[model samples]
Target: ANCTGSFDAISASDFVANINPGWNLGNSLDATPNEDSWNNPTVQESTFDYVKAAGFKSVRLPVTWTHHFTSESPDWTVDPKWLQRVSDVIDMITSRGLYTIVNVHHDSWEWADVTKSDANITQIEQKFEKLWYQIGTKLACKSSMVAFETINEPPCNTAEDGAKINKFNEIFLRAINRAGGFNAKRVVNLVGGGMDSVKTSQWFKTPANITNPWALQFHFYSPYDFIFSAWGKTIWGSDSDKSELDSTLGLLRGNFTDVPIVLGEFDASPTNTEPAARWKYHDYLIRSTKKYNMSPIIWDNGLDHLDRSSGIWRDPVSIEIITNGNETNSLPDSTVDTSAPSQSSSAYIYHKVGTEVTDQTLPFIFNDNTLVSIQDSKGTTLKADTDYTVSGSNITFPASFLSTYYSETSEPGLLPNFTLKFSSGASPVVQLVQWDTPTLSKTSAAASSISGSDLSIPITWKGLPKLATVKALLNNGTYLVDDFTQWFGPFGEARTTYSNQWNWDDKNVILTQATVEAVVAAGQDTVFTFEFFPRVDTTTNTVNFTLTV
Candidate 1:
């Protein structure tokens, strides 16, 4: 199957138009060390199928290769296994008829950063060339559906930084061109300064060696407080917000009118309790992008509450909003005006409340504290003054309840677990305040002497999910290695004792049989520390142990 094609036949604008409503494969292959570093499920072909079926025509796959390749200059070959893994993912998307974009993601620290000193610049320039040579040459057989993004987000603190990034882009284009084949005819993408500011777009210059069509790429996360949950603003919309989107897109479109432009990434936190406001942000942003004929790739890092594997959107309202927003491009400006949502009476819910009850009060405050209803775990309604008193944002229980709850003879089943509820008057939101689980505890029972071929340590842990990926790291005096891997002295420092990736089975047993071959030679009382991190719940636990020969 020949998936190779030339973008030479299409204009830049035409190329941009070909990719509509894209999704980002985030926090997966782009992860350092390994793909599952972020605890997200592995990437499956069905993920692409779900995206295509959900109205997304393109996917921007962010990848990090610094850890997968050699650090030195002369031999900058990427691991063949890693390259093939990337190719397999590319084929998964292209084979499904979806446009795929692969980029040098998260390589800034090791090389891609242009803001560094002159010596760093000179070094990364060569590294960048070699990196792209391997990447471009490897996937050169891919069709135009597979575009190449130079870098994810190049940091440009100053105009000089922007110039350096442009130079890097120039180098990237030349290397891809020299690689020949499909890459020569592929549509390349470039960006400037955080990939956010329109003024920064002025710094991007066309690489002199480029022979293929290219597009301008930028990201949008305006109303940062509301979108990123960084600042005070928890709500978004109003004519001003809509106008902000309009002006930004208009300015970018005017600046790069000749070629195509893509909003490489744009996403708001779906966990925002204000559902209507969140939906409005998406509706207005998506519709406005369509109005300007720019493609917006919704960045998904699993926070959208959508499961790509099962093709299920936890928030169906978001699904409808995006699907409808995609069709609004051709509509008139007045057709999609900002409107307030109708009033609805619904219950407000909060779960996972662990730290709120620190002292004598529970900080379960609501918008309208004066008017609220409190219920206990027994489903019995409690009075404000009789059972608990509501003082501003604090909920204080009676002295009797507090005293008995923490008494030496107090039992777990006797304590009251409260559930607060009220109406926001606009939208009903679910706020979870469940009890936090106890701290994870573990115990190990194994002899301190090494006599056999394998060293076995029986460990029992509590408070971890049964299906979590448990990684056990052993730090011998000299190096840290995973279980089963041999540690060579000095030159071959295999710090990893075992594969960092392990699927903890779903059995109810708390015992984890951690066994490893004796890596070090005879030693006195050698102290070893085993570091355990359960991917299911990013909690790090350390076990200090001693072994003797």
Candidate 2:
């Protein structure tokens, strides 16, 4: 085989077209060590039913074969029991008249990584080829609805590593070539260099003498800060955000026009991201992929999309937008950016415990969807005129409804949520809150106090349990966070990023060792601004703690 590495697609464009609005069956068969070792239970036939009911036409089944090998090096024989389980799961998916994709998932990092220093390259190569050869033989008779991805995000660092990934693609095709049956006609999704869009575009090479149908694939998690919830940057749907996504998709389409393409995995889950922002992102991503002729398969790591046990979707509105492209329902623009008070959210109605509970009014986005009825946690609907009233886009809830839990005698925390049913599209949630300023266990600390570990300070949360935004400022009249982010405009400047710098638990807020080291290296006292949700007034709901040199 010559090393051009491109697929000679035989009606593969139609294969990509038919698998739109697909969902990944993640964290289950894909779990490491064993099938049930991770968060999800064993794969169920009913799980596929829930997926189809949620409007997914295809399922991306990620399987981990790392622990299933019976022997090493020579044969690398996969356990027959594991192969049968995987084969049976594929049947469960395709048997439901839906398309399912199978791929080497966590195994890519387990032993297939070429970048690891201790990795045995020769054994890895043999093991990789043998692994797929067995899988190809087992699922060779699978219908056309099944697709095979070479590997899931194969780790690579440089051009040398990238070239190995390209060879892996060639090797995969060759193994399938030898494992006859309907295999030669199977549609394989070929990827290059981590399955990343940019890397795939630059370094991918097509293998010659392709007998099977194939498509090029890439994974997307763009605007890394926004998607991963870094730097307290919550707001989205700006011109730059949409343009950035559009440009990335344009580049992908611009490079590869011959082979059909698939966005193998893409998601901005509802658990961490704001509602409106997530919806906008989902809407724009689907539209962009459609314009460029790419099918999208959403990533769901058990807890992100659907509650598997309850059979409940975490955010049905975002799902509706992704599946149907429905733009009829409007959502509140929720953010803690005090710069835009007029555009702040009505999704939360806050009442301080000591103050008298008066009639509370909050605003909706007013995108033409009429508020029809409002309901409490119970199925009973609140009276339209007596319990609540709407004028223009503002809905006012009587103090009687809020005072049920917001009185001085009541505890300060989250009350039961209210769902606002609309005339059309998915309904929105309005959370009633009783709040007081949360207190930090420590008011001041020395930078030297943090030796070489994360500094954890207890928190007595009087309001919401989560931290919304954090700003780190040096005492020497400059910012101590993200040195170059001063150009990110109002909402981004001085914001301490998430994951590394700051994290919170139920009773404590933590300053990771990296953040503390940053302070020591700067050799200056710093003030860390911590803000929480139910963020009605900026200064009222925030606490600032000082770090001394």
Candidate 3:
């Protein structure tokens, strides 16, 4: 509010302080860059135009009227001139076919701006009615591109706060309904997870069972990692610092299953290393978010600011709709408009010839390892042998195999309880040997054994130094790593034997298990384990699990 006055005073002759009638461009609040903002060069008509030209569908204008009006606040006549000014601006944003997002930006600070005492709540309710009533009456018959965001980012972290947002939304909706006409159908954006940060996103459990055409709002500027990881956050790809976030994504999306999620913000600067990796991180973000089927809005405040640190386009290939990591150009001079998502490649799941059931279970998942993954096309996995039903391209295992710690569950940061080798034919056997200071020594096999209905086999090793790679050859084009091995360690620390990769790793991606009711005829399964001769940290560790049926 104060800022509007400052701009008006300085640019008086050229830019009149046009107060929209019935609205409060007259009053200012205490937040920076809002009404109190005095010398901002960003308020020009050209600025809004640039946004539309740059692929932005709408501009959300923040307004604060608390300080400007006295007593019961809103006047029913609703400042006519003020309403006209706001109406014209709304027209400018919508004229270009871009969606216009308007909301009460800043007003309630910690002093309980949006909600508080019962009296305050009632006053707010009246103000809201007056506010939307005036705005709706002014622009109601216009195109439906206009949207009303209930309130910007609400200030509260508790479920109670989220409840308040929902309640307020209902009240606001009533006002819009009373105003009547097209305003009723316009999109309503809700804010309630409190503060719009990751903590808030997590804390924010969307209001249960809301009517359709509403979007849940959240802002993501978690740069300490999302935006700043490439540079200062040395832990981005640290070996020991594996993250459980990927799995959590599914839960987060699942938890907020009822509504659409609108990622309000996320962006990178020209001078940050984060930009270089932005594409990759963004792609990762996209891959996870796309699962939830939500819209991601990038926060590119400036269309032409280049970052010197990591150049402009970070992780370009990753974010773009490209195949097999093919990116010929650098940061795109051509802006990528993500509003209507480009065609993404078809989702795929490769088949590993034979099944190798971990002593754990058939569709076992190492939630901790992104490298080690398996998912059923319809959102689950199949089990080992047993007559199965196939739907479309989906191969549904006879049952949901929750074996145990080995097959069912296990400790957080440990190898699965057991690794099983599956074969259409014979299950391969292996001898033991420990690798020491550059030499191999035979071992007694106390570290491993076999038992169970499937004859559980231990993939553990009593011998090995530095690195491990258990290798074995199948009859023809098959091979298998007899034991469980994967890299484990922190950034700049010792990684586990399983970390390395081999040429046949992809082809050798096999699952193991103890029992197979039927061999299915002519299939061969081999299992063996070994430790790497020489250890190197950077290259992938080599291991194989082969099956032929």
What lDDT does the true structure give each of the candidates? 0.59, 0.80, 0.38
Q: Give the winner by TM-score.
A: 2
Q: Per-residue lDDT of 1-549 in model 3, one digit per residue for the tens? A: 011111111111111111000111112222343433542322334544544433344455444434333335555344555556556767766675555556655544532354454437666667766766766676566555556666656666566666666666676667666776565555666666444544445555444554325666565554343244211121222222113434545555566666666555455432232222343344455455555654555543232131212234222232231111211212111111212112110111111112232221122111222211222324343343432332332323322342221221222122211111221111111111121222222222211232222222223221222222334333453323222212212111221112222111211321223212111122444333332322222222233333224
TM-score of each: 0.60, 0.85, 0.45
TM-score of 3: 0.45
lDDT of 1 at 127: 85
Query: Which candidate tops lDDT?
Result: 2
What's model 1's TM-score?
A: 0.60
* Count of backbone clashes, every candidate in sequence: 23, 7, 62
Q: Model 2 reaches what TM-score against the true structure?
A: 0.85
Model 1 Cα lDDT, one tens digit per residue, 1-549: 133544445556676787777888888899877887884777888888777777778888988998898547776889988889999999999889888889998896555776666546777788889999889888887877888888877777777777888887788888887888767678888767778656456677777756778888888888654564321133455578778878988887777667678889887755432444565677778777877778878787765655866788656545544544533211001112212121111111111223232334544324342436666656677677876676765556665654433442322222344444544221122222222232323333333334443443444433222221222233344432332223222111222222221122333212212332332332333344433211111233334445433
Q: After superposition, how far is residue 34 of candidate 1 from its true place, in Å?
A: 0.9
Query: Whose lDDT is higher: candidate 1's or candidate 2's?
Result: 2
By TM-score rank, best first, the candidates go 2, 1, 3
Number of clashing residue pairs, candidate 1 = 23
Candidate 2, residue 102: Cα displacement in angstroms equals 1.4
